[PDB]
Amino acid sequence: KRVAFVTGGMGGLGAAISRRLHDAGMAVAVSHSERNDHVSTWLMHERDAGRDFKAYAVDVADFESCERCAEKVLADFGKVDVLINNAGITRDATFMKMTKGDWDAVMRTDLDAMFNVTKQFIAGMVERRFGRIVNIGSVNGSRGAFGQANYASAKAGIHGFTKTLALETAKRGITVNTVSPGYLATEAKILPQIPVGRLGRPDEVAALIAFLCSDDAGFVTGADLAINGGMHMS
Amino acid sequence: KRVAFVTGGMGGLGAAISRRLHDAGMAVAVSHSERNDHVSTWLMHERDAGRDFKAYAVDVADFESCERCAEKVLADFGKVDVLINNAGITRDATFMKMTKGDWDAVMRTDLDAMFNVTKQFIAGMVERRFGRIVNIGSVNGSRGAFGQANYASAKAGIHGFTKTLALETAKRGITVNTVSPGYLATAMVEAVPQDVLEAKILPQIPVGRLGRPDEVAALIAFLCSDDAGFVTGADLAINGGMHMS
Amino acid sequence: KRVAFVTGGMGGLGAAISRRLHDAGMAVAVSHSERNDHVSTWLMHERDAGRDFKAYAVDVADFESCERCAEKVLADFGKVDVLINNAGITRDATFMKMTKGDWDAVMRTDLDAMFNVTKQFIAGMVERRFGRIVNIGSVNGSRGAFGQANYASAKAGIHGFTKTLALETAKRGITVNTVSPGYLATAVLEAKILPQIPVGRLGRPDEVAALIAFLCSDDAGFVTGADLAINGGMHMS
Amino acid sequence: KRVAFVTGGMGGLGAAISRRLHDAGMAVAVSHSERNDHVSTWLMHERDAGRDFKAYAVDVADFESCERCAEKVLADFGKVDVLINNAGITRDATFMKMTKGDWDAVMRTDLDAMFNVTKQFIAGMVERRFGRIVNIGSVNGSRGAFGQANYASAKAGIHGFTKTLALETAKRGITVNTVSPGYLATVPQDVLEAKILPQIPVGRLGRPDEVAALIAFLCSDDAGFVTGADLAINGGMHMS
Ligand SMILES: NC(=O)c1ccc[n+]([C@@H]2O[C@H](COP(=O)([O-])OP(=O)(O)OC[C@H]3O[C@@H](n4cnc5c(N)ncnc54)[C@H](OP(=O)(O)O)[C@@H]3O)[C@@H](O)[C@H]2O)c1
Numbered sequence: 001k002r003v004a005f006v007t008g009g010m011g012g013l014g015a016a017i018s019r020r021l022h023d024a025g026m027a028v029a030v031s032h033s034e035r036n037d038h039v040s041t042w043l044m045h046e047r048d049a050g051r052d053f054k055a056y057a058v059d060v061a062d063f064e065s066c067e068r069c070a071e072k073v074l075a076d077f078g079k080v081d082v083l084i085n086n087a088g089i090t091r092d093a094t095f096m097k098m099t100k101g102d103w104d105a106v107m108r109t110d111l112d113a114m115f116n117v118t119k120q121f122i123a124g125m126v127e128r129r130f131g132r133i134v135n136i137g138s139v140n141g142s143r144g145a146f147g148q149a150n151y152a153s154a155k156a157g158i159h160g161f162t163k164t165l166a167l168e169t170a171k172r173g174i175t176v177n178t179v180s181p182g183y184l185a186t187e188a189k190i191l192p193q194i195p196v197g198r199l200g201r202p203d204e205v206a207a208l209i210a211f212l213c214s215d216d217a218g219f220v221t222g223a224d225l226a227i228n229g230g231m232h233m234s
Numbered sequence: 235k236r237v238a239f240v241t242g243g244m245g246g247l248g249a250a251i252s253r254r255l256h257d258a259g260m261a262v263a264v265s266h267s268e269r270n271d272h273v274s275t276w277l278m279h280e281r282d283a284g285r286d287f288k289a290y291a292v293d294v295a296d297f298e299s300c301e302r303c304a305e306k307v308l309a310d311f312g313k314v315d316v317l318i319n320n321a322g323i324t325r326d327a328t329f330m331k332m333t334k335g336d337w338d339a340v341m342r343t344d345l346d347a348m349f350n351v352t353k354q355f356i357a358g359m360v361e362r363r364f365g366r367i368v369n370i371g372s373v374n375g376s377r378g379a380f381g382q383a384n385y386a387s388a389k390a391g392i393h394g395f396t397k398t399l400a401l402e403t404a405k406r407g408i409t410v411n412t413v414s415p416g417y418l419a420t421a422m423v424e425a426v427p428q429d430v431l432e433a434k435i436l437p438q439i440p441v442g443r444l445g446r447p448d449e450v451a452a453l454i455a456f457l458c459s460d461d462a463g464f465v466t467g468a469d470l471a472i473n474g475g476m477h478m479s
Numbered sequence: 480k481r482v483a484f485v486t487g488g489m490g491g492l493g494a495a496i497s498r499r500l501h502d503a504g505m506a507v508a509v510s511h512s513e514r515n516d517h518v519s520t521w522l523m524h525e526r527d528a529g530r531d532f533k534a535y536a537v538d539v540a541d542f543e544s545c546e547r548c549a550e551k552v553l554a555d556f557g558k559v560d561v562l563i564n565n566a567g568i569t570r571d572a573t574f575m576k577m578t579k580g581d582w583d584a585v586m587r588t589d590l591d592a593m594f595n596v597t598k599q600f601i602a603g604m605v606e607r608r609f610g611r612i613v614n615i616g617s618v619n620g621s622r623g624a625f626g627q628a629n630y631a632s633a634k635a636g637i638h639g640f641t642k643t644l645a646l647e648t649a650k651r652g653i654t655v656n657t658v659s660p661g662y663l664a665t666a667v668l669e670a671k672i673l674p675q676i677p678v679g680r681l682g683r684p685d686e687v688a689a690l691i692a693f694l695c696s697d698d699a700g701f702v703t704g705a706d707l708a709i710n711g712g713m714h715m716s
Numbered sequence: 717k718r719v720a721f722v723t724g725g726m727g728g729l730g731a732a733i734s735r736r737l738h739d740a741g742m743a744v745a746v747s748h749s750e751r752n753d754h755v756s757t758w759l760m761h762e763r764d765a766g767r768d769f770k771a772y773a774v775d776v777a778d779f780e781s782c783e784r785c786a787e788k789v790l791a792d793f794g795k796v797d798v799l800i801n802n803a804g805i806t807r808d809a810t811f812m813k814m815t816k817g818d819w820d821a822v823m824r825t826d827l828d829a830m831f832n833v834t835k836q837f838i839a840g841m842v843e844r845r846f847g848r849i850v851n852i853g854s855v856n857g858s859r860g861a862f863g864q865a866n867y868a869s870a871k872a873g874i875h876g877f878t879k880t881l882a883l884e885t886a887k888r889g890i891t892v893n894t895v896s897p898g899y900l901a902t903v904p905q906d907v908l909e910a911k912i913l914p915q916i917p918v919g920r921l922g923r924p925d926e927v928a929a930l931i932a933f934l935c936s937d938d939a940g941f942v943t944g945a946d947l948a949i950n951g952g953m954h955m956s
């Protein structure tokens with residue numbers, strides 16, 4: 001049985017990913033933040049809907065926290081085959097008004113997490129000669145993003161990580177890809193810039209991610225998969 | 235019942251696409267070239283494997299041939315919901331040695347087909363407010379390739395077409411995407427000398443193997459599904475790590 | 480003394496390119512279309528402003544025409560070191576309404592020119608181990624554009640050509656690059672075009688020509704196979 | 717008289733940039749690292765070569781250091797029109813062997829610098845309605861970079877910053893661009909010959925002065941319509 005770990009797995013996109021991977025037959029572990037005030041509630045509602053998840057506290061901005069979390073996940077599941085680096089935040093401000101704290105918080109959570117989280121699971125994937133690592137970027141890592149110098153930098157940086165790790169793991173049965181969603185239903189200045197004329201559904205993005213985590217996607221690696229309603233093309 | 239039309243549907247990649255779309259529950263029409271000498275045999279083997287396809291002659295480089303083909307497809311199936319522009323050829327030569335015929339043949343088959351084929355089915359998709367158009371590009375459109383000034387140009391041009399048509403159709407429930415494969419296990423690869431396969435082709439591919447047509451077909455089947463309506467104007471790279479950007 | 484040949488050298492962008500290359504010290508030849516009705520007027524006014532150009536008729540959509548043109552250029556200048564594939568047209572229509580003639584006209588002029596024109600000058604560049612080939616694309620090849628299924632495809636295809644020819648010529652001292660301008664002040668802008676341009680103005684042909692002059696210089700030999708975007712921020716990726 | 721500030725202005729690429737901008741007629745200030753032990757000698761040699769530079773200590777990974785540096789630069793020159801974010805380092809390791817220290821050192825120097833340095837100069841450029849901000853990326857922010865998960869992430873992140881700042885400043889006569897050099901003649905010969913040069917179509921390393929010449933064009937009055945762009949100068953090593 002394939003094991004998936006989804007950071008931010010109780011958030012808007014993360015919950016959709018977790019449900020799709022569970023329905024594809026994977027055993028699914030989710031992370032939750034230290035500040036999360038609804039861990040037991042979320043698990044109960046998912047169980048009522050027919051899905052048993054296990055949850056693990058983590059601060060993806062903190063390497064030692066990721067170590068403690070990974071120890072628990074691996075103790076319970078024995079391995080992680082599929083890693084979704086989905087946790088993320090924004091701290092929007094014009095560059096002129098942006099604080100060092102705004103910058104750092106986004107950098108540490110959205111980009112350092114690539115190192116902090118993936119370091120804990122990569123050795124096992126390499127040892128077993130199988131893995132799927134999916135890093136959640138953003139259309140605003142590609143298009144210019146007003147008021148988001150920190151978020152755009154972190155999200156663009158994610159794809160540099162994806163490409164390096166893809167090259168390093170390509171002969172070990174692992175793929176590493178970036179999925180860059182557009183704006184999700186999770187907005188009178190946004191909708192006009194989306195050609196399909198609607199926000200994206202988290203379940204749609206989750207469906208693409210489930211394909212990438214499947215046995216049919218072993219030839220997709222180092223790629224950036226854009227699912228943005230046409231908002232950005234290049 | 236969703237209807238798909240796959241150009242080059244009996245070729246290496248096209249056959250894999252046709253099978254995947256059929257297995258997803260679509261009614262599948264395939265094109266074949268006018269001089270294809272094995273059409274009945276191909277249909278019989280697919281029937282033996284449990285899949286009934288209907289096959290239609292076309293020259294995708296010729297607008298009138300595409301018109302005649304589409305007339306017959308629509309007479310049998312009533313509509314086309316899913317169009318896979320997959321037919322394609324190469325005519326490799328260094329630019330110094332490339333002929334006018336080499337250039338025109340690749341441009342007309344590989345790029346003009348975007349116009350010649352898609353024009354025959356776009357109106358119905360627009361009126362029904364649903365469609366999936368998938369154009370097969372190439373990793374060599376993205377990175378360029380020695381000996382392929384014609385082919386890389388045509389394959390790069392395909393994505394310009396994809397982006398424009400995506401913009402024009404986005405409010406009609408249609409998506410238009412480019413799929414750009416790396417080297418695949420088909421006949422083009424199988425005609426390569428073994429030493430060239432080993433020393434020149436495989437070292438280009440980080441995952442260390444050619445891609446299977448069925449893998450590319452699986453990605454295309456996702457794009458043609460009801461879960462991919464938010465993917466449009468994209469270029470989806472499935473190349474084993476051969477190219478990243 | 481480097482020789483440049485600029486197709487569409489008398490048009491909006493082409494004239495600015497020709498002036499910049501001349502001012503960089505090159506001997507400049509320009510093409511003109513077969514029915515251009517102001518060739519001698521243009522040449523005289525450029526001479527009045529201090530620049531002696533020579534002009535040559537061509538149809539870049541026709542291989543034979545390009546043969547004849549290159550024959551005349553090479554007879555007068557001896558060689559061509561720098562080739563600017565700048566001639567281009569649009570034939571806008573929604574895809575639903577676009578005709579085969581709309582498609583073919585843009586494809587043959589804008590994309591086939593890569594073959595028809597460059598085939599006539601590539602051998603000399605390879606023989607001399609020096610060359611600069613600059614192909615004019617468009618921001619609309621990068622982002623796609625309503626009504627331009629033909630033009631966006633042709634302009635996107637140009638960069639596929641650039642990358643391949645760059646690979647084939649890189650060990651022979653030749654560079655091949657695409658320059659993709661945004662909307663230019665050439666011959667409703669406040670409501671339709673300008674709001675899409677972050678810098679809030681159209682581009683000047685001379686600005687694009689200045690970038691091209693850099694790419695054609697001895698300082699740009701490490702730029703090849705690139706697509707240089709000069710679009711006022713209209714498209715980023 | 718246009719004023720330029722070049723971080724890492726005494727390094728391999730940075731010195732070539734500083735010379736080109738000086739020769740274009742700009743007044744040029746360069747940064748140096750805090751423990752750079754050859755500031756006086758470097759300045760003297762440039763002076764003997766006919767170029768008067770002013771040098772300033774900074775740690776681009778530290779916001780307060782950037783503040784002190786910028787205040788002294790602005791006191792001496794009155795303004796900065798042209799900012800070259802060129803300081804940078806590598807800490808190469810395979811991902812399996814890479815430490816948090818390797819990652820943080822590259823992130824803070826190569827990516828946080830975009831914030832730490834540019835924050836000190838942006839207000840003046842906005843007020844004067846002129847600016848050129850050029851951020852030095854890398855071909856390895858575009859192509860896959862084996863053994864450089866940290867450096868590739870930092871360099872790719874730079875272009876996200878470029879594009880945002882380009883959008884926010886475009887109406888104020890400021891351009892912001894990424895320049896992404898390939899491998900430069902600034903490593904064992906066996907690695908150069910087996911791993912690097914075969915992947916560069918032109919078959920040679922780039923010269924720092926070549927990259928500096930492109931940067932000089934981008935900082936000129938002819939480049940005001942180039943913004944939010946990534947300008948690749950890599951010998952053909954990466955195309956897309
Ligand atoms: N929403 C969109 O339109 C959109 C578009 C493109 C990309 N994205 C990306 O999609 C991802 C998911 O975001 P979302 O839209 O689902 O927003 P969301 O509902 O706010 O979810 C963000 C998730 O991040 C987790 N998280 C944040 N900081 C964390 C930390 N330090 N340690 C551990 N977990 C942390 C949260 O955990 P808890 O729930 O446990 O507190 C939460 O589940 C993000 O990477 C975002 O950048 C979103």
Ligand SMILES: NC(=O)c1ccc[n+]([C@@H]2O[C@H](COP(=O)([O-])OP(=O)(O)OC[C@H]3O[C@@H](n4cnc5c(N)ncnc54)[C@H](OP(=O)(O)O)[C@@H]3O)[C@@H](O)[C@H]2O)c1
Binds near residue numbers: 268370415416417422
């Ligand atoms: N193979 C790879 O490594 C690779 C990699 C990237 C992209 N691609 C693309 O994948 C697509 C399919 O190629 P393939 O590898 O499957 O090669 P293939 O086996 O040679 O198939 C090419 C197909 O094109 C059809 N065709 C060619 N010219 C035609 C014309 N004028 N009118 C109608 N049909 C025509 C052929 O039809 P008949 O069989 O009926 O004669 C054939 O089915 C092409 O677009 C190719 O560029 C291939």
Ligand SMILES: NC(=O)c1ccc[n+]([C@@H]2O[C@H](COP(=O)([O-])OP(=O)(O)OC[C@H]3O[C@@H](n4cnc5c(N)ncnc54)[C@H](OP(=O)(O)O)[C@@H]3O)[C@@H](O)[C@H]2O)c1
Binds near residue numbers: 489567664
């Ligand atoms: N203007 C913009 O906003 C813009 C933006 C991006 C890209 N571009 C590109 O810039 C280039 C120059 O166009 P422009 O803006 O300067 O427009 P333009 O003034 O209309 O110039 C087009 C040029 O193409 C030449 N030409 C057209 N068809 C030809 C043919 N079959 N054979 C030979 N010459 C032919 C014309 O020659 P004659 O003058 O001799 O008749 C003319 O000089 C084009 O490639 C265009 O796509 C323009």
Ligand SMILES: NC(=O)c1ccc[n+]([C@@H]2O[C@H](COP(=O)([O-])OP(=O)(O)OC[C@H]3O[C@@H](n4cnc5c(N)ncnc54)[C@H](OP(=O)(O)O)[C@@H]3O)[C@@H](O)[C@H]2O)c1
Binds near residue numbers: 724730752776825853
């Ligand atoms: N060399 C290449 O092949 C190549 C290719 C692509 C991109 N690049 C980029 O080009 C830029 C310049 O590097 P280079 O090739 O010239 O290498 P270099 O000779 O090692 O110079 C790096 C520069 O960074 C400065 N620096 C490092 N950490 C600093 C800090 N914390 N605070 C202040 N200054 C600091 C150094 O200052 P001091 O000299 O004062 O100590 C030095 O001038 C870097 O961004 C690099 O990533 C280089």
